[PDB]
């Protein structure tokens, strides 16, 4: 059996003091119906189509976590970052 981390990277590419442009890599040949982005103060949630590799978060005065669905055959925990 094999197990893959989806996504593999999570990067804050651009930022305003209230917005945040987040980005992640996409595993080729890996099906992702959608992504769930959770953000909070080191929570709030939203979802985003599997086609996308970028997202924007507004309404901020921070931990960001990316889940990929379906959930099986994954490393065991999602990718996360602090900003």
């Amino acid at each position: 059996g094999s197990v893959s981390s989806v996504p593999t990277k999570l990067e804050v590419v651009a930022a305003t003091p209230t917005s945040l442009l987040i980005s992640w890599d996409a595993v080729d040949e890996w099906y992702v119906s959608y992504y769930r982005i959770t953000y909070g103060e080191t929570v709030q949630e939203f979802t985003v189509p599997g086609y996308s590799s970028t997202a924007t978060i507004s309404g901020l005065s921070y931990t960001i976590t990316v889940y990929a669905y379906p959930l099986w055959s994954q490393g065991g925990s999602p990718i996360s970052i602090n900003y």
Partner: protein, 270 residues
């Protein structure tokens, strides 16, 4: 509601093996490496080309309702190298109805590779011979009447009706379920009218998302058709039951809500 997330968390570990799809000799037969058929419900193909090390594999699962005419085949969209395998599967199961859930290309991405000849044309896929005798067009779908038979065996020809759904939006689900319901009513009229008809094939792209929505809606609508309003419509239980035969049927929350909306539209129509 929040039950869809509970089902998604329930599918974070799969309880049945998918080893045949993970073999090296099958690595080029799957659109995605994480969408694989269960071993105990996968379709086993006969009469493959012996030059290939493995010729009995296709990313396809038999889906049965449980609390061939009333069963389905859920499979991925064809790849360029798996079209002959798709037609071998359609012939081997005596299937008479195919439901395409996506267009050939949508938003630039190839979802379903063309595996049929044009109207009044004829093409051979391996040992299978497919003839397109008539194409009709409705608002929500395109019907193509095909003739499938084995080469050198004219007494094996049967009609396969391919219902290609084309109205599904690029993002999200249809805002109204009337088109899907009329489409499935036509498919049900076609399948019921053929004696000893095999499983209805439902496929395109990954073959779990829109495919799962279609299959689950059809199952629940048939329950309502058979017993009326005095029956139990358990959407999460039906999703769990179909997921025990193919992983991840129905993928988004919008499709989850669309199942409820279509079932209630059908109930209010009766």
């Amino acid at each position: 509601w929040e039950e869809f997330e509970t089902l998604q968390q329930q599918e974070c570990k799969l309880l049945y093996s998918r080893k045949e799809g993970q073999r090296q000799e099958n690595k080029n037969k799957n659109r995605y490496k994480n969408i694989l058929p269960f071993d105990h419900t996968r379709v086993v193909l006969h009469d493959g080309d012996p030059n290939e090390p493995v010729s009995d594999y296709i990313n396809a699962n038999i889906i049965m309702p449980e609390f061939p005419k009333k069963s389905y085949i859920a499979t991925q969209g064809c790849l360029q190298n798996t079209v002959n395998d798709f037609w071998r599967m359609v012939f081997q199961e005596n299937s008479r109805v195919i439901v395409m859930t996506t267009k050939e290309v949508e938003r630039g991405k190839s979802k379903c590779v063309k595996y049929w000849p044009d109207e009044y044309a004829l093409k051979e896929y391996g040992v299978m011979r497919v003839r397109n005798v008539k194409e009709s067009a409705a608002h929500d779908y395109t019907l193509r009447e095909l003739k499938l038979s084995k080469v050198g065996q004219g007494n094996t020809e049967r009609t396969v009706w391919q219902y290609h759904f084309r109205t599904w939006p690029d993002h999200g689900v249809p805002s109204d379920p009337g088109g899907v319901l009329d489409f499935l009513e036509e498919v049900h009229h076609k399948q019921e009218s053929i004696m000893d008809a095999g499983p209805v094939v439902v496929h395109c792209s990954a073959g779990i998302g829109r495919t799962g929505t279609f299959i689950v809606i059809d199952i629940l609508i048939d329950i309502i058709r058979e017993k009326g309003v005095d029956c139990d419509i358990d959407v999460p239980k039906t999703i769990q039951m179909v997921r025990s035969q193919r992983s991840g049927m129905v993928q988004t929350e919008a499709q989850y809500r669309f199942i409820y909306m279509a079932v209630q539209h059908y109930i209010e129509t009766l």
